[PDB]
Each structure stands twice: as structure tokens, then as C-alpha cells.
Write a protein that binds this ligand. Structure first.
Ligand code: AZA
Ligand code: AZA
Ligand code: AZA
Ligand code: AZA
Ligand code: CL
Ligand code: CL
Ligand code: CL
Ligand code: CL
Ligand code: NA
Ligand code: NA
Ligand code: NA
Ligand code: NA
Lengths: 295, 295, 295, 295
């Protein structure tokens, strides 16, 4: 037998960093969860019990904190690229670093209509994520994403004209609830290294904001023919607004809300045009995915 | 042996309701999770296999949907009271109903600076809850709460002057991070029945809003001497603003963020006044509770 | 306003302890999660910012580790009682300690049909728990429990003869699936203090084992008329086998598995006597509780 | 823009099936969670709102139940292959089906030392999984796995001789606790279609059993030089015992248990040879992966 692939490192490293403006007294906090996995000439640790090739995962953890101390942690695309580059440059035998970062929301509180200098609220479990793969001699590949954005519209969703055969019981509909948890990923063109990533720094936050805005507006305004059709419209617009993105991927559950027939009870009318009370279904759920790239 | 206490019913009943304004086209959604447990002269179902006394839990589920169809579901204090009253009035042998409701956030989306008629976002896992106990001949007891409100302040929290003995290693501090998940409950004076609950309907939403506002403002503005001292200030203010509340209870975890000494690495300074990077601790956590009532 | 009730301490303290037999080389591990909350003359920490009355929660954490180092951690009833007694004896102004312990399973592995000296498996998320309340001048109250024991029987459960009215759609049945997660609690007679708890030490593990055995056998053998009837039989037997128990409480979800009518598809028969494929329902669920004491 | 990849279907479909032996009265239950995603000539549903190409996800759900009714559901490798083949054969424009199955444990209860005919216990959250990809003209690729197998050994694990530099604080050790949650996947050689999968049916359960046994024995018996070295030994043995496996992948967290220095308290000795009480760490954790194939 032979080692075909191997990677190892530290997962679930929670990091918080505060920035304090001495002039204004304003403080800004960042909190993330980081995973770093390394690859390289490490097969002998598996096959020969040769630990001399292992950068201990505890050391990887230390490196994450030290790197956060000495560098900006925002945008996460930049931080991930600095962190990944560190490992391939520092260690001759390490040839790839894979860095995943999940950014947690700490939103500045408004008290009496003004922004508070040092108090924050977690407004939702929505995350902003990055995956950065730094591969020696092959540059830096970055996938940025948002996840956990949960939305619902109560009308202006339809689903009719699908294939009907002997396995089909679903009725066509011209008015239904549509609700999903959005997972959207945009993949950047390959960057040659850290200098190039630095040169594009302003684009990272702007593109995240654009992706979020396009998702929300399209969802709210589309008279949706299906999840498939609506998500394609979102992806199309993101690609149009940022030329440095190569592909956009959406993965969307269709979280069903079922009508409840109450007619058995005193002829109560609660279906079709009369539907007011529905039963949200925890499972099963549709799952719809697509990856959109350029012609 | 004898049955000393017994209650039974249906838990985890998910309900969604939509209200459609025909005039304006504006739609408003409510989503809740409901639990109803009944008590009464039901001991023989346990001791003699006498099912004749059992209102099936499936029927309780049906009743929740039917009641939501025929009544407003907001404020949840009113809905819970209608639902609980139903069971004690409908069934001679049922003498208490215990209704718990968890309200999930569906916040209207703003698209291009205007409120959208029918699209909603889940902004945070914060809940608004009620517990309603309807007891035949003893009225209606209502406890209202908010939970899952997660906040952090990066300075203006202190903790010094605590007991020091041979079990103590904790250093006194004049500047630390304070972060918690707020669980706050206000208990209403007993109501004689549904007519009295109806008479106070406007107070329910207003008091929820006040409790939230007082919590957030006090947390942000208090130069906190301890979690204990800050939470007492919150409870005091809520009791002052609503005379129909008898007690306020807060239950607050102290979610610790630890300094990381980096001095072992090139004399890097990251403690005390130089602390910028911290390690959030998933566990253990302080847990601080208090119930405040009137003199 | 006044402080009506207050308690504070440390939650989610994870503890592992190993015992090493030097003679046989056999090692035995225990892992628990502990919560300790104190009450006493501590109101001034809330009302006057007087921290002098606070035993820091960090010190409580230290005390848990020190106590585990110097005492047996099994049975958990004994450990909880030692830990709770410590606080009320050590601190003049602390008058009650509330200790909750969750014991996690680490079951010795059998390799090649023999017990391994130092390797363990987590066989299920079933827990053994204790709640110990040590109140100065009022002794020690102990509630022991098992939770997270998930079982299913595929036949020999019935449910018919329940109340039918205009809210009822449920069909009577003489053969259904019954599945639940068992939560069972037995409450001990009050103990005068640690000496008395020590005197009964062998009864704690034996009663846990009896409670588990009675639960499993009764569930498997009862031709169940309802969850209510079956759970009463369990509680009755536990009370009969251990005179030092005052009450037994069961709390049982009824986790529903629904028939799926497939007759719309080529007349396929999958209901009643022909039912083979079912849809487990994640929610809602019945919830049935009872507390059984002595005549 | 263009659709580069697309797949859609139904996730989280819970299925239970019972087999009843009329002769012996013995009943056997299977419970699974199934996900089916399809690919094919479906781009127009995204780009042109053409639903005519969509097999509704609700129909996919129906198909899962119908298929379970008419076929064995064990071993899951066979069931997944039948289910996947169905879609590519039934629908001309569907060219790949991706089926994931998670099998939940329902273990027959022993009551009074004998196997009960119809009562079952969930002994642990360990799962047996399959991923089956059925691709028209390219056969059937099957990856089988076990996951959620949580183990701990209290000694006979070492970690020394790793790289030490200015980022390293970890001390070498010759005796530590090792605990992990095992995720192991074995990938079968490609099968030409359902006939070939049927021909190997007995190998599926046997190989699962072998993989489990090898994992447990190796973990318990290896005087481990590292997670890397121990996991390689496991993978090597599995490949040796089943020639129809091409690769074995392990993904193992290193769940840390830290010594607690108690010497600050009355010189109490709890480190090194004197370590008895440890603090399990919820995070961060090492994560070690490897894929082993044939020379
Ligand atoms: O077994 C281990 N492997 C590793 O790579 C490692 N790094 N720190 N501790 C460790 N233990
Ligand atoms: O065992 C049961 N008890 C109940 O109270 C009930 N209600 N619906 N189904 C039921 N099954
Ligand atoms: O605010 C606090 N209250 C407490 O009781 C405590 N104990 N340790 N740290 C603490 N912080
Ligand atoms: O938007 C939808 N897309 C689908 O593929 C589907 N299938 N059932 N319902 C559906 N809704
Ligand atoms: Cl769907
Ligand atoms: Cl605390
Ligand atoms: Cl029920
Ligand atoms: Cl590790
Ligand atoms: Na390198
Ligand atoms: Na009544
Ligand atoms: Na005392
Ligand atoms: Na096909």
C-alpha cells in the first residue's frame, strides 16, 4: 500500500481580535473560527512513524494567533492568504496550505439612534466564509461565500409544468410559500501570490456586499417559476458585476410549508385562496444546486 | 403506589400563519412552535388502561391549527390564553392547560430602502416566548420572555474585590470583555380569565419592547462591576416601567474570552493594555441568575 | 425592588478522571459534565456592587477539579454530595449548593472476546445524571436519573378507546410502532448529611441498574395499551424494589412513525396488515409525563 | 453566462422498513435517511424556466418509498444502486444519480439473556453510510463508510520527535490520552451495473464488519507513535483483507484532554506520572486525514 493523499492540521480554532481607535475611542471586534490543513512531504509520518516531518498541530494553532496579532484579519480573503503563504514559505517540505475561515457577526449596537463605541450584537447566524488554498508554484485559489441567510416570501412563487408520470402526486401551483437557507459561493480567478491578492483587497468586501444584495433583491422581486430559475438569475447578475469572479455556485434547500385541510372540521376553509395556516415541514426538503460560469 | 402528578399533550407543533391586507397588498407572517400539556382527572389512563379520559395528543395538534385559523396569533400572550382556556372549557375533566409558545423572527425585508410587501428575513435566532398556565378556578398565569439575544462589549466591564482564598487563582481586572446570551422573563400579575387578558392586550408588545430596550441600553452603558450588578439594574428598570409585572428573572451565562500570552514568541506583547487577540472559550461558563420582585 | 431569589456558579465544567490499578494494570475512566450553583447571603453583589461576598465562579471551577482529585467520583450521588457539602461548610455565608452532574459513557472495549485494560468506546449518548441540593440545616436531597435511552418496538402497542369529538381525526389502532427517548428520575428520601449518604453508597449503582432493567423489560414485554399505561407499570416496579425512593418520574416523547399509503401507485398495498414502509416524523411529538409516589 | 454544473433532488428523506418472519414471529427493522440528487439535460429549467425537464423532488421522495417497498433495503450498497439505476433507466434525459444513505442503529434488545423478537435499542450514534454514484455509460461507483465511532484510550499513546521551532510550545510526551471520532471510507472498484453489484452482495456487510473490527483492534493494541502512524496501520490491513477495495480514507479528529496543574493548591500533584484528573477540551482539535491506495 501507499499514501495517495494526506493532509493534517488544526480545526475549530476560535479567534477574536479587537481594534481600538485611540483618537475616537471607537472599538471594532472580529471573531472567526479557523481551520488550517497542510500537505507536503509528510508521508513518512504515516508510514515510518517519522515525526520529524510534522509541524505539530498545536504549533499551527500558535501560528494562527501570532499571525492575527501581526496582521489585519479583514477582509478574511487577505488574512487567509497571509496565513496560508506563511506555511509554504516557512517550511521547505510543506507545499500546500488549506485555510478555511468562518466569520461570525458582531454588529455595532445603536443606542438611542447612535452607534455605540464598544457594544455589539449577534444579528443572525449568517456567516461570511472563505476557503483559501495556497499551493507552492501554483498561486492562491480563493472561494468566498455567504451561508445561513434564511429568507421566506409568502407569495409570488409558482411551480407548474413539471414532468408528470406514475410516480407523481404533486399538484401544480400558481401561488406558494418559498423559503430557503442561502449558501452562495463565488470563486476568484487564480492569484499569483500575496502581492496580487493585496492589489485587489478593496474588491473582497465590495463583492460580498454585492452578492448579498443581489441575492436578497432577486429573491424578493422575482415572480419565481422555480428555485432553479430564480437562483440562475442571482448567479447571472453577480458574474456581470465582478469580472474577477470565474464561477458562482448556489446550494438552496426548498423548506416546505404545507397547506392544512381543515374542511373535516365544520367545513372550515383553509386551502388554496383560503389558506392562512400552514404546517412548516422540518424534513424532507428539496435541495437544488447550480454552478454558473462564463460563456 | 399512586399517581402524584400527571400531564400529557403535544410538543413541537410548528405553525405558520399569514395575514393578507387586500387593500394595501401587504402580507405579514407569524411562525411559532407550540407545546400544550393538559392536566385533570386522567389518572385512570395510567392506572387502569382507561383511554376514555384521554383527549388524543393528535386532537390537541388539530386544535392548535383550528384555533390559529379562527383567532389572532399575536400577541402570543393572547393566543396562548385563548388556546389554554379552550381546553378547560371544552372538557369537563380537564382542569389545567399549560401552553408554551416560541415565536421565531420573520422580519420584513427592506429592498432599495423600502419595506417589501411579502419578503422576510430571519434576523437572528433571538426568540420571544410565552408560558401560559390556565388553571380552572384560579385564572391565567403568564410568563413572557426573550431568549437567545447574544451581545458582547469589548471594554467597560470590571471584576475585582471578590473573595480570595486557597481555591482562588483568578486575577482581579479593571478591563475585560463581557459577552452573554440573554434570557429574561417577566411574570404578569394573575389574570382572572380571558376577558381581563383581552383588556391588557396592548401592554404585551409594549412590555416586550421595553424589556428588550432596557436590556440593550443597560448592557451597553453600564460600567459593569459584575454580571450580578448589571443584571440587577436591568430588572429594576423593567419593574419600574410596568406595574402589572410582579417579578423579572434574568439568567445570564458569562461567556469567557481569555487573553493569550504570546511573550514566549519574540517578546510579543498581547496581555493587559496590549491585549488584541483573545481565545473565546466554549466551556466552562459562568451562570448567573436572579429574580427581582417588588419591596 | 428586592432580590427575591439568586443563584450563581459555573456550568459546563468537563472533568475526566482515570483510576490505574498498579497490580493488574487495568485502567478505568470516568467523564462527567458538572454544574455548581450557590445560594446564600449574596444579595449585596447584585444591589450594591459588593463583590466581597462572591466566591468567583473560576474558584468554583478550581474546586471541582481539586475535589475530583481527592475523592472518588463514583457513584455520582456521592461525589455530588461531597462537592455540595464542601461549599456550605467552607463558606459561612453560603447556605445552599446545587450540583448537577451528567455522566458520559465510556464502556470498556472487548477485543477478541476479552476486556481491554485501557481502551473504551462511547456506546450511545445515554446519560446517567444526578441533581444534588445541599441545603444548610435541611440535609441533602438527591434526584438520580437516566436520559437519552432511545428504544423502539415494531408491534405490541395499541391505542384505541380514546375520546372522540369534533376535533378528532386519529383512527383507533390495535397494532402500531412505539418509540421513545426515556427520561426517568427517582427521588431519594432526604438524607441528613454526608455520613448518611455514605452509608447508602452501594444502593446508588444498584438502583440505577434496576431502573434501567425495569424500563427495558417492561417496554419490551408490555402489550401496551398506551404510553401512559406502560410507563405507570415501570414506575410501580421501581418503587417496589427500592424502599429509599420516594417518587419516580417518567417523561416520554411519543416519536411517531406514520403509515404511507402507496395505493395511488399501481394499487400497491402498504397500510394496515400490509404496512412495511413507514415515514418517521421528526415533529410534532406526543409528550407524556407522570410522577408516581407511595400510597 | 452558462450552467457549468447542476444537480437537484430531495434530501433528508427518513425511511423505516420492517421485515416480519411469519414462521418465527421475529421482526427486524431498518431505518435510514436518504438523499437523491439527479443530473442530466436539465439546464433549461435554470435558464428558460422550462419545468418540463424537472422530475419533481416530491416525485423523487415518492420513488424512494416505492423502491423501499419493492426491494430489500439491505445491504445499503445494493439498495442505493437499485435506487440510482432506476432514475437513469426511467428518464431518458437524466444521466447521473447520486444517492447518499445514512443507516441508523436499531439493535435487537436482549431481555433475560435472550434476543427479543420485536424490541430494539439505539446503541450509539455510530452510522453506516453509503454514497452511490450511478452514471449512464460509466457504471456504479460506491463509497462505503462508518462514522461517529467515538473511542478513547487512557495510555499507550505517545507523541515526540516532532519539528520544534520558534512557533512550538508543545512538550514531547511518552504517555497521553488519545480519543477520536472515527470516520472511515472504503471505495469499491467501479462496477459495470446492477448485475455486478448483485454478484458481490455478501461482500458488503462482511467488509463493513472487517473495517470496524480492524479499526477497533488496531486502536486498542497499537502503541501509538502518532494519529498518523496508527491510522495508516488500520488502512493497510483493510486493503489487505478485501481486494475489491481500491482506497481507504480515514479522517480523525484528535480530541485533546489536557493535564491540570494543581500544584498551586497545597502542592497537590496532578501532572505527569501523577496525572489523574484532566480537562477535556471541546475545541480546537487536531484533524488528521489520509487516503491509502495500492502500490
Ligand atoms: O498524533 C498527533 N499528531 C499530530 O500531528 C499532532 N500535532 N500535535 N499533537 C499531535 N498528535
Ligand atoms: O400512547 C398514546 N397516548 C396518548 O395520549 C396519545 N394521543 N395520541 N396518540 C397517543 N398515544
Ligand atoms: O461578573 C462576574 N461574576 C462572577 O460571579 C464571576 N466569577 N468569576 N468571574 C466573574 N465575573
Ligand atoms: O422550485 C421547485 N423546484 C423543484 O425542482 C421542485 N420539485 N418539487 N417542488 C419543486 N419546487
Ligand atoms: Cl423542492
Ligand atoms: Cl462567571
Ligand atoms: Cl402521543
Ligand atoms: Cl493533533
Ligand atoms: Na514550502
Ligand atoms: Na374543565
Ligand atoms: Na455555610
Ligand atoms: Na437516462
Amino acid at each position: 500500500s501507499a499514501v495517495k493523499a494526506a493532509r493534517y492540521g488544526k480545526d475549530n480554532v476560535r479567534v477574536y481580535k479587537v481594534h481600538k481607535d485611540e483618537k475616537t475611542g471607537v472599538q471594532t471586534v472580529y471573531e472567526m473560527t479557523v481551520c488550517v490543513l497542510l500537505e507536503g512531504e509528510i508521508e513518512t509520518s504515516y508510514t515510518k512513524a517519522d515525526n520529524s516531518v510534522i509541524v505539530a498541530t498545536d504549533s499551527i494553532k500558535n501560528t494562527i494567533y501570532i499571525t492575527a496579532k501581526q496582521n489585519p484579519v479583514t477582509p478574511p480573503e487577505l488574512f487567509g492568504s497571509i496565513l496560508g503563504t506563511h506555511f509554504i514559505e516557512k517550511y521547505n517540505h510543506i507545499h500546500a496550505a488549506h485555510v478555511n475561515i468562518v466569520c461570525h457577526r458582531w454588529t455595532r449596537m445603536d443606542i438611542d439612534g447612535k452607534p455605540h463605541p464598544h457594544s455589539f450584537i449577534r444579528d443572525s447566524e449568517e456567516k461570511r466564509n472563505v476557503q483559501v488554498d495556497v499551493v507552492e508554484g501554483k498561486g492562491i485559489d480563493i472561494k468566498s461565500s455567504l451561508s445561513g441567510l434564511t429568507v421566506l416570501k409568502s407569495t409570488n412563487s409558482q411551480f407548474w409544468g413539471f414532468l408528470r408520470d406514475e410516480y407523481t402526486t404533486l399538484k401544480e401551483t400558481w401561488d406558494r410559500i418559498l423559503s430557503t437557507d442561502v449558501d452562495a459561493t463565488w470563486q476568484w480567478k487564480n492569484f499569483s501570490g500575496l502581492q496580487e491578492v493585496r492589489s485587489h483587497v478593496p474588491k473582497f468586501d465590495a463583492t460580498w456586499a454585492t452578492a448579498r444584495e443581489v441575492t436578497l433583491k432577486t429573491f424578493a422581486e422575482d415572480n419565481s417559476a422555480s428555485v432553479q430559475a430564480t437562483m440562475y438569475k442571482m448567479a447571472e447578475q453577480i458574474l456581470a458585476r465582478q469580472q474577477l469572479i470565474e464561477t458562482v455556485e448556489y446550494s438552496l434547500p426548498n423548506k416546505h410549508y404545507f397547506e392544512i385541510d381543515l374542511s373535516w372540521h365544520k367545513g372550515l376553509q383553509n386551502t388554496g385562496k383560503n389558506a392562512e395556516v400552514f404546517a412548516p415541514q422540518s424534513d424532507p426538503n428539496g435541495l437544488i444546486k447550480c454552478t454558473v460560469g462564463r460563456s
